């Protein structure tokens, strides 16, 4: 159900904040976001930063200059029918330190969640990439980002919910917080009362599956890859999505893509579909890029994306 | 919807305040303005002196003989369909320091505009080229320029506003003023009663944009020059007009005209024309003069822009 | 809401069609409507005849130099914020015979409005003094004439519906067409989707206004003839406009003049305004005439006119 | 050399005949005028209405209360040496209609002629601006008024005369009355057996010259409106008064009222002074008002007044 990209550059030079727009970071590209509509994918995966929406304090108002662009983006791709998700790219972390008040970011939830409330091609996901916490710290960060959106009144969109160690689908079961417990072990009993969580985890195919290297491991890495996480879905019952993936310009990284890909297509009882990392308007040559006039990645990846 | 010349001739010899008449500076040749509105140029820029329009101080009263002068060329160009843009040659100063009352510089304006406020084929251009200040206090002055001209009741006429670092397209978007601010964080806040803003920006295509050397960097400088500025008037639902811009009687120079004027027209959504530097009665050689009568750069520029 | 003049002279020797430009018939002298307008005055009802506008058939194409012409003088007025009201002079009847064709007179007017379809100060007038027809037949070429302006695409402008009998306020209820039906009987259900419709009435001052004496009647008669009309629009909750009036320069004449504007501004819920009879070039000494240079009515009427 | 003032009152609420002193017309401050008598000015346009100093028909009697109000004002002006022009403000009117009776006329300014036949300090003016006349009937009638006035045997005083077309002296030669003639071509040939006839022009500064626009038309308006004026006055062998002229309180109305004033001085030899419209004790925030406490014109034009 789900085919689309990253967008990614508001969350851009994150050692100056609030840093300079234009000059620190940007927002997205709306007409290449239209071309990408037009060809059929429908969620577009806004990254920004927390300190960029609502600065110096989680509890405190939004800054209307961000906040507008966001609101602009957002309603560029829900007014054509795609999803737009809202990404806080802050790694559970707010000013370089761990988020560990659950009732500070409910609050900073409920504000955001407040402003698209009544948007159902809207989705929140709660923070990008935790790592380097708590198992259990992690659990009840994304319960607190649930209860502020819902307490806000948005009660038609999904919740992305993420987990600890970069929210690895390779790791899921056995990746280790800081107080020795894996995702499957702390992220299963996530309650909604709505009951549209969606787990949303992230796949790389380089050897450390940080996406950092170029070559892919192998033309089955990613499916085999997704395996583990695949069974603990259909067990606990839950679906999940592929908030970020990639491959390079390679003839290895593409099979082991279509592999992953076709895999959870086959699997799509717990797979909803898959969000590409990335696109964006000033990744220059970088090698994950899609964005459609110089993405190294567009001519081999886009076609791959549309399935 | 707008294509013309720049009438260059009465802010000449600026050393010289007053100055005299016939000796320092001059108007312009309404023959051959006419010659241009037969062709069908529909667009005038008129150079003029702050001080010599407003002398001392700019709350003060206008000379006459100056202000007749301005009129009679304005009601030549306007009687016949064409717009009349009225452009204090002024670079954000008044007697060589730099404009830092935006109370002074509104009411400069309500008394200029209330001396056209009934010519709806007239333009109000707030100031020639600010540089080397705030971009804030360049943004605060425009915005109490519409403030003035509104508050004399000249409601029907365009206002251009010009950006600081002598407002050019190429650079909108990356140079500082003296406070680091830029035109594109600056200049976007300015709002207007009657929803007439037009951004006036300028491009000349030698290598420091600076009009200086007869050669062009190369054939698409032009329109490679304008993408930073067209993007950021997209984003920012703002409309413009390239009020200065020049190449000089070479290939090279030529095609980079052509080449950037259509890509004004390609992108038309956000440029409404462009006004050639310069016509004028007193520029002799000068390369970029197209004056009928006597410019070097008459026969091959005129014919390009009427397009 | 309008006050002005009408400009007669386009249509003068109706007997030669084409006729001659300068022998037969002129254009309206701009510098005097130049004049009306800096005094206040905001409609000008531009005379001319279909014939010289659409010749040979109503279906064809227009005349370019007669259509020139009106679009110059149109033009004149609109772009210095009046009102141009167009007017074929001609009685109901196309080559001097009614016009019992509603196909061909709607086509006639689908012609003439796409040619000002975008003029929002532009109004239509289906056609001046119908009469000697049936009451029906007037009110359906009405009918037809909106079609045709709606249908070329001119929505932005008033149409001028003109009755039966002269299209005489005075004898709006009364006077019967060749069916035995009045205006008022016939003339209600005009219908347009833009919903501006003006009434468009006639009212002159001696015994049989046919405003051909320079007699009126007493001093009251201008406003008691109205009342009836008046009557009737409020009834049936429609507006109108006093299209052509005059009184010859006597007491009695301006006394009863001022009355009838002075009731007009009493009843302005129905009267939206009214129209004198007549300005242009070519009038010399009509007893009617306010063109200013040498109209023997202006000293008198043109103070009255602007109330 | 006479410079001063209008009053203006005694004819106010002329829709009211008689009307009723103290609501519809009031007589004028005595203290006021005792001001601007000592500060040099010496004339006095008393205006009032015929038909409140002589009712029902032009050969009755005064009425008591009106004469002997009119009386005190002008043996105030008078007894302090300044001239008291008597002006019935009437616009050849009597009863609302236009003076055909140059036998009823002459009989009117008998009378009230007779009423200061002694006192030589008073001038007689015929009627306030005629217009919409036939120009040979205004003649007429002004020699009639002379006729009357000397048979009273009031021989001392200067009898102003005014023209057809509001005795506007811009219009002095181009004009024409209801038969076709100027006030050049039918004023010229007066007779008084004193030989004091005074031409009486009025001029304004606005567009129209209609006096009723706080916009002067230029800086020079003044001067060059009274020149085909001063031609035929100084040809003919005439002399003559301004007995009317305003300008609002605007930088360019003040210089147009300056040099029409200095025009008037270095043509004394025809030109014998200006009498401002105006003063008064009702005129309240009027744009021209110079009424010492209350006329928002008196702080910039009375010192231009007394030169
Ligand atoms: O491009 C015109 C614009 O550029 C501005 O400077 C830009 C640099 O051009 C650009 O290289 C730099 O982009 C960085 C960005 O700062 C990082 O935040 C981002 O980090 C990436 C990381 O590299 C990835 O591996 C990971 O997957 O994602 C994160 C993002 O979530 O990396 C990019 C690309 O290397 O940003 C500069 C601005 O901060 C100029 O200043 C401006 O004037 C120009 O107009
Ligand atoms: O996913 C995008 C994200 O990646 C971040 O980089 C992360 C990788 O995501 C993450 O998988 C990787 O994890 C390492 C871990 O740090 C090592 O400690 C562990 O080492 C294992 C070893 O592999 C075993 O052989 C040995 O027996 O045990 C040790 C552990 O005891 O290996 C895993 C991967 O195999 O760490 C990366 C960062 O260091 C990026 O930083 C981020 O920017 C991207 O967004
Ligand atoms: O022409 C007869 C007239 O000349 C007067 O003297 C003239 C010089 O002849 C004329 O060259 C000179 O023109 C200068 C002008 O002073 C400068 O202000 C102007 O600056 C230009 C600049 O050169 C351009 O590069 C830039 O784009 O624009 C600015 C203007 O905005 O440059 C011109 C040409 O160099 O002006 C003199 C008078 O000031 C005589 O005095 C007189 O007697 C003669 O009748
Ligand atoms: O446009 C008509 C106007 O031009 C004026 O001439 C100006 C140019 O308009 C302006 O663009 C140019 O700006 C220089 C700037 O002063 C330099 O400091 C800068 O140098 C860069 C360098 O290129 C970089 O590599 C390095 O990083 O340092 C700096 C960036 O910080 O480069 C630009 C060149 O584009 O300056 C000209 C002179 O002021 C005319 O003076 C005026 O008459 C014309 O009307
Ligand atoms: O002769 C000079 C000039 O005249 C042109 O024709 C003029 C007529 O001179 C002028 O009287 C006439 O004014 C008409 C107007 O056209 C009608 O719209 C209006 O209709 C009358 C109708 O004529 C009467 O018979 C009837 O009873 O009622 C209506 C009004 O209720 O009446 C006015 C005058 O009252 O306009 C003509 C031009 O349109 C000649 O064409 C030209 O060649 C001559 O040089
Ligand atoms: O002040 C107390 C008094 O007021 C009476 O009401 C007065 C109004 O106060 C007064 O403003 C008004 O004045 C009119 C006057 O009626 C008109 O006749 C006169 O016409 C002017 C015209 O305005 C000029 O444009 C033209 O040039 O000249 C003529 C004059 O010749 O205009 C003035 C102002 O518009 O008159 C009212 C009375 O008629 C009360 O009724 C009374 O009770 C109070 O005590
Ligand atoms: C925005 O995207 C469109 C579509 O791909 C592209 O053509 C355009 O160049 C992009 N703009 C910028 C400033 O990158
Ligand atoms: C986007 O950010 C810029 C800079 O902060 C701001 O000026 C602009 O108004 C913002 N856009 C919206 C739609 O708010
Ligand atoms: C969370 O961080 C705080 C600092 O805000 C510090 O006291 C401690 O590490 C944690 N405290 C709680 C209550 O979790
Ligand atoms: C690909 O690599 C993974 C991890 O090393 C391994 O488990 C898998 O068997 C490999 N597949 C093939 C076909 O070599
Ligand atoms: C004015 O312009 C005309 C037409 O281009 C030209 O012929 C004439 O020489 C010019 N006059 C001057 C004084 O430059
Ligand atoms: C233009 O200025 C000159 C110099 O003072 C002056 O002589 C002339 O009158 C002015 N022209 C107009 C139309 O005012
Ligand atoms: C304007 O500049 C002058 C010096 O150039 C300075 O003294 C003055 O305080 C400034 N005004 C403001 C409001 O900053
Ligand atoms: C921005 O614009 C608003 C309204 O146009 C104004 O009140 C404010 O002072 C401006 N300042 C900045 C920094 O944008
Ligand atoms: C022209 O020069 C500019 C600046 O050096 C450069 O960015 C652009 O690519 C050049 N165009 C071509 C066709 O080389
Ligand atoms: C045109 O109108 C002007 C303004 O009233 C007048 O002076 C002029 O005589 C008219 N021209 C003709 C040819 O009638
Ligand atoms: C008006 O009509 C005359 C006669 O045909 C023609 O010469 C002239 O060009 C026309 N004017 C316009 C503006 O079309
Ligand atoms: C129009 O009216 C009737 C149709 O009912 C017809 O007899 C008459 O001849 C027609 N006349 C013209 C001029 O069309
Ligand atoms: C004016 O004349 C009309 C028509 O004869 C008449 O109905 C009306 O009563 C007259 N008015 C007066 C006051 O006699
Ligand atoms: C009469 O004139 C005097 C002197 O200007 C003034 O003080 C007084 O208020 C005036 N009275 C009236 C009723 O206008
Ligand atoms: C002025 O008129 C009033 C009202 O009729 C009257 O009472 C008064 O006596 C008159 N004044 C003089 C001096 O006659
Ligand atoms: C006299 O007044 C009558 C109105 O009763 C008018 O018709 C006439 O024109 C006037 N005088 C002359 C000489 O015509
Ligand atoms: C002032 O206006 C009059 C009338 O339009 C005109 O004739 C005269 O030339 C104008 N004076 C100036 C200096 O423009």
Known sequence: RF??????????????????YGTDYTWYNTT????????????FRLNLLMERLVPNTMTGPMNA???????????YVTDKGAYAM???????????????????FEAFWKTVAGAFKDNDLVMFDTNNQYYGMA????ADLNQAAINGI?????????????????????????????????????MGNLTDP????????????????????????????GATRLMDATAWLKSNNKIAILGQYAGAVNSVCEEAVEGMLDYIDENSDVWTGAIWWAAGPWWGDYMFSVEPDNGPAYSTYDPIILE
């Open 32 to 43: 290449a976001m239209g071309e990408f509509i037009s060809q059929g994918m429908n969620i």
């Open 194 to 221: 709505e009951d549209k969580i969606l787990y949303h985890m992230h796949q790389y195919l380089d050897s450390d599956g940080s996406g950092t290297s170029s070559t892919c491991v192998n033309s089955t890495i």
């Open 135 to 138: 198992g259990q710290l992690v």
């Open 86 to 104: 809202i990404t806080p790219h802050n790694y559970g972390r707010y000013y370089g330190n761990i988020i560990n008040s659950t009732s500070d």
């Open 3 to 20: 085919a689309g990209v990253n967008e990614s550059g508001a969350e851009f030079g994150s050692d100056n904040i609030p840093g300079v």
């Open 150 to 186: 819902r307490a806000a009144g948005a009660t038609s969109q999904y919740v992305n919910v993420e987990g600890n160690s970069y929210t690895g689908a390779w790791t899921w079961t056995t990746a280790e917080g800081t107080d020795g417990l894996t995702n499957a072990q702390t």
């Open 65 to 75: 200059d961000y906040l507008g662009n966001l609101t602009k983006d957002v309603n």
